[PDB]
Design an enzyme around this catalytic site. Sequence first.
Site, PDB file in Angstrom:
ATOM      1  CG  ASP A 229      -1.773   3.799   1.554  1.00 39.97           C
ATOM      2  OD1 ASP A 229      -2.154   3.976   2.726  1.00 39.97           O
ATOM      3  OD2 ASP A 229      -2.551   3.510   0.614  1.00 39.97           O
ATOM      4  CG  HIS A 252      -0.621  -1.804   0.555  1.00 41.80           C
ATOM      5  ND1 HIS A 252      -0.131  -0.685   1.192  1.00 41.80           N
ATOM      6  CD2 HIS A 252      -1.968  -1.694   0.578  1.00 41.80           C
ATOM      7  CE1 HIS A 252      -1.146   0.069   1.582  1.00 41.80           C
ATOM      8  NE2 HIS A 252      -2.269  -0.520   1.216  1.00 41.80           N
TER       9      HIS A 252
HETATM   10  C1  LIG Z   1      -6.767   3.080  -1.209  1.00 45.30           C
HETATM   11  C2  LIG Z   1      -6.059   1.713  -1.099  1.00 45.30           C
HETATM   12  C3  LIG Z   1      -4.536   1.920  -1.287  1.00 45.30           C
HETATM   13  N1  LIG Z   1      -6.594   0.853  -2.175  1.00 45.30           N
HETATM   14  C4  LIG Z   1      -6.309   1.039   0.269  1.00 45.30           C
HETATM   15  N2  LIG Z   1      -7.694   1.086   0.625  1.00 45.30           N
HETATM   16  C5  LIG Z   1      -8.505  -0.077   0.391  1.00 45.30           C
HETATM   17  O1  LIG Z   1      -8.092  -1.028  -0.186  1.00 45.30           O
HETATM   18  C6  LIG Z   1      -9.948   0.098   0.743  1.00 45.30           C
HETATM   19  C7  LIG Z   1     -10.399   1.238   1.642  1.00 45.30           C
HETATM   20  C8  LIG Z   1     -11.887   1.390   1.894  1.00 45.30           C
HETATM   21  C9  LIG Z   1     -12.827   0.406   1.223  1.00 45.30           C
HETATM   22  C10 LIG Z   1     -14.308   0.554   1.465  1.00 45.30           C
HETATM   23  C11 LIG Z   1     -15.460   0.696   1.631  1.00 45.30           C
HETATM   24  C12 LIG Z   1     -16.944   1.020   1.691  1.00 45.30           C
HETATM   25  C13 LIG Z   1     -18.089   1.313   1.713  1.00 45.30           C
HETATM   26  C14 LIG Z   1     -19.562   1.712   1.729  1.00 45.30           C
HETATM   27  C15 LIG Z   1     -20.393   1.178   0.560  1.00 45.30           C
HETATM   28  C16 LIG Z   1     -19.959   2.646   0.589  1.00 45.30           C
HETATM   29  C17 LIG Z   1     -21.054   3.672   0.943  1.00 45.30           C
HETATM   30  O2  LIG Z   1     -21.763   4.029  -0.221  1.00 45.30           O
HETATM   31  C18 LIG Z   1     -12.365  -0.704   0.304  1.00 45.30           C
HETATM   32  C19 LIG Z   1     -10.887  -0.860   0.053  1.00 45.30           C
HETATM   33  C20 LIG Z   1      -5.510   1.709   1.362  1.00 45.30           C
HETATM   34  O3  LIG Z   1      -5.667   2.823   1.791  1.00 45.30           O
HETATM   35  N3  LIG Z   1      -4.503   0.871   1.899  1.00 45.30           N
HETATM   36  O4  LIG Z   1      -3.753   1.514   2.887  1.00 45.30           O
HETATM   37  C1  LIG Z   2      -8.068  -3.347  -9.554  1.00 43.53           C
HETATM   38  O1  LIG Z   2      -8.264  -3.852  -8.249  1.00 43.53           O
HETATM   39  C2  LIG Z   2      -7.140  -4.524  -7.696  1.00 43.53           C
HETATM   40  O2  LIG Z   2      -6.490  -5.236  -8.384  1.00 43.53           O
HETATM   41  C3  LIG Z   2      -6.742  -4.345  -6.238  1.00 43.53           C
HETATM   42  N1  LIG Z   2      -6.135  -5.558  -5.754  1.00 43.53           N
HETATM   43  C4  LIG Z   2      -5.728  -3.178  -6.184  1.00 43.53           C
HETATM   44  C5  LIG Z   2      -6.293  -1.988  -6.962  1.00 43.53           C
HETATM   45  C6  LIG Z   2      -4.377  -3.599  -6.775  1.00 43.53           C
HETATM   46  N2  LIG Z   2      -5.523  -2.700  -4.831  1.00 43.53           N
HETATM   47  C7  LIG Z   2      -4.472  -1.678  -4.719  1.00 43.53           C
HETATM   48  O3  LIG Z   2      -4.494  -0.574  -5.162  1.00 43.53           O
HETATM   49  O4  LIG Z   2      -3.366  -2.081  -4.039  1.00 43.53           O
HETATM   50  C8  LIG Z   2      -3.477  -1.787  -2.679  1.00 43.53           C
HETATM   51  C9  LIG Z   2      -2.461  -0.686  -2.499  1.00 43.53           C
HETATM   52  C10 LIG Z   2      -2.985  -3.103  -2.154  1.00 43.53           C
HETATM   53  C11 LIG Z   2      -4.784  -1.420  -1.983  1.00 43.53           C
HETATM   54 ZN   LIG Z   3      -4.147   3.615   2.951  1.00 45.75          ZN
END
Ligand SMILES: CC(C)(N)[C@H](NC(=O)c1ccc(C#CC#C[C@@H]2C[C@H]2CO)cc1)C(=O)NO
Ligand SMILES: COC(=O)[C@@H](N)C(C)(C)NC(=O)OC(C)(C)C
Ligand SMILES: [Zn+2]
Length: 267
Positions: A229, A252
């Site tokens: 990422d 991000h």
């Molecule tokens: C990892 C990072 C950086 N936080 C971000 N990914 C997300 O925020 C993100 C990715 C997938 C889901 C889902 C689902 C679901 C589901 C079904 C209920 C389960 C099945 O039992 C929710 C949030 C990212 O990769 N950004 O690039």
């Molecule tokens: C604790 O849950 C949160 O506060 C989310 N907003 C958080 C965990 C910061 N998401 C997060 O990892 O940043 C990304 C890279 C934007 C996906």
């Molecule tokens: Zn990602």
Amino acid sequence: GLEKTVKEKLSFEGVGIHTGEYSKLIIHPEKEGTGIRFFKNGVYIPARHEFVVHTNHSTDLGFKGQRIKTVEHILSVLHLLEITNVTIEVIGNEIPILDGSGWEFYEAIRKNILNQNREIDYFVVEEPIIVEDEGRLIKAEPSDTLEVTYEGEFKNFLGRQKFTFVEGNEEEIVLARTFAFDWEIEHIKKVGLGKGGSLKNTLVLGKDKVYNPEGLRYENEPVRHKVFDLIGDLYLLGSPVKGKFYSFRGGHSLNVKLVKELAKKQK
Ligand SMILES: CC(C)(N)[C@H](NC(=O)c1ccc(C#CC#C[C@@H]2C[C@H]2CO)cc1)C(=O)NO
Ligand SMILES: COC(=O)[C@@H](N)C(C)(C)NC(=O)OC(C)(C)C
Ligand SMILES: [Zn+2]
């Protein structure tokens, strides 16, 4: 290295992780000096930090009322392959998530590279910098090679993990999938996100269990993905990057904050 584009148009399609909608991409060859840009409804949206419109759970770009969600994975692949000139035409509102990793993009693009006639003007980190946000931190320092470390501190069985990408090890991060924690998914859906998430495109983890029957691709798959990422977000500097980076719990929002500070310092 040389500036690069693609030799012919390449297409990808599928559901988007946050919108849950089906979208299609066409990647178009472009001449030297074009840069990386998206195209939607007649509008070009450069892959640059000035066009960032959202950074919570994805990095999204917009210009002139046309928006594209979740650019970080395709941008990371382009950064890793040093593709510098292309137009990503998007029919829809989000980049397809595919299997949750960069793999399908990486394999298709890598076999379709066209070298061009001038060299890349890399964004070269010139001096150390640190950005912080409530316990999270990212540092950058000069390096002749792109090196990126992510350290996570997870509130489940994973505990603390860290992983470092260096040039030549692209294959170590392009298969690492996006991930989510079961106790967080309800909120993510309530805030209008994650509509396309499933066990087919996301590594879903509990406090003490893995939901995916196939398990993790790597014991540290989540931190490999966070490195992936960050490499995508770094491409919002507008050129492939040379520098050594360390992110502790970054995401991000902090990634983009770092990009904007680096761009301001070297304007
Ligand atoms: C990892 C990072 C950086 N936080 C971000 N990914 C997300 O925020 C993100 C990715 C997938 C889901 C889902 C689902 C679901 C589901 C079904 C209920 C389960 C099945 O039992 C929710 C949030 C990212 O990769 N950004 O690039
Ligand atoms: C604790 O849950 C949160 O506060 C989310 N907003 C958080 C965990 C910061 N998401 C997060 O990892 O940043 C990304 C890279 C934007 C996906
Ligand atoms: Zn990602």
